[PDB]
Amino acid sequence: KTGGTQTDLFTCGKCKKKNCTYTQVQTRSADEPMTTFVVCNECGNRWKFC
Ligand SMILES: [Zn+2]
């Protein structure tokens, strides 16, 4: 009950598995382009990629 998709491109930094979700948002406006964040659906370890 969050707003992301199961992608499994990056591993977590704890559970060391492949069940991470990512979202592609672009901070303030849709003309100030994308940022890719990756969040583990398992323990909740999150980091970014861009
Ligand atoms: Zn984790």
Side-chain angles (χ1 to χ4, degrees), residues 2-40:
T2 186
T5 48
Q6 290 291 170
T7 179
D8 317 317
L9 343 89
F10 312 92
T11 283
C12 164
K14 291 171 167 59
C15 322
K16 73 169 72 289
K17 321 215 293 299
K18 291 294 306 308
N19 185 47
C20 296
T21 269
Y22 85 141
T23 180
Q24 316 200 272
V25 179
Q26 47 188 170
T27 53
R28 185 180 179 240
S29 188
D31 288 63
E32 196 292 292
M34 187 176 288
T35 317
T36 296
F37 305 146
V38 192
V39 50
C40 158

